[PDB]
């Protein structure tokens, strides 16, 4: 089993944000499983591993681009297939950063729901 925490980042401000601005921290712990796979879940996933996607603001409907940070992606142990579906895997008992993807984004003041699916993997 996995103990999963997803923690939103404090002090985010509307307007032009820094490239790769951190917006949430994923924390996955386990006493029994060595690795986990993770995918973003939304109405518009934009890559073949589910590690970048778009999310809509609750009050405005404006979209922002979100995903695992470049540093987090470089920490992946592997990309494995679960009945043909790609999941990038990472060490359990570790944290990953969810960020605003790509070049600087101009973010409208709003609340943006971020949803992830995490699954245990034994390598």
């Amino acid at each position: 089993d996995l103990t999963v925490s997803l923690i939103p980042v404090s002090g985010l401000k509307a307007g032009k944000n820094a490239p790769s601005a951190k917006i949430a921290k994923l924390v996955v712990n386990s006493t029994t499983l060595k690795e986990f796979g993770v995918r973003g879940i939304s109405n518009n996933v934009v890559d073949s591993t589910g590690t970048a996607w778009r999310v809509a603001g609750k009050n405005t409907g404006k979209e922002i681009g979100v995903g695992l940070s470049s540093d987090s992606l470089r920490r992946s142990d592997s990309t494995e297939k679960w009945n043909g579906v790609n999941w990038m895997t990472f060490n359990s008992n570790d944290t990953l950063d969810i960020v605003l993807t790509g070049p600087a984004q101009n973010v409208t003041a709003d609340t943006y729901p971020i949803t992830l699916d995490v699954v245990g993997y034994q390598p």
């Binding site: 089993d1 996995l2 999963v4 925490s5 997803l6 923690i7 939103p8 980042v9 985010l12 401000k13 509307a14 917006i23 949430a24 994923l26 499983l33 796979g37 879940i41 609750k58 494995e80 679960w82 999941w87 973010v107 409208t108 003041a109 709003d110 609340t111 943006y112 729901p113 971020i114 949803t115 992830l116 699916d117 995490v118 699954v119 245990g120 993997y121 034994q122 390598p123």
Partner: peptide, 19 residues
């Protein structure tokens, strides 16, 4: 290697950008 289907979880949080 193998995935453990019973361990799959969905987690959600809100990122709030303020003026």
């Amino acid at each position: 290697g193998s995935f453990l289907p019973n361990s799959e979880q969905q987690k959600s949080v809100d990122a709030v950008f303020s003026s």
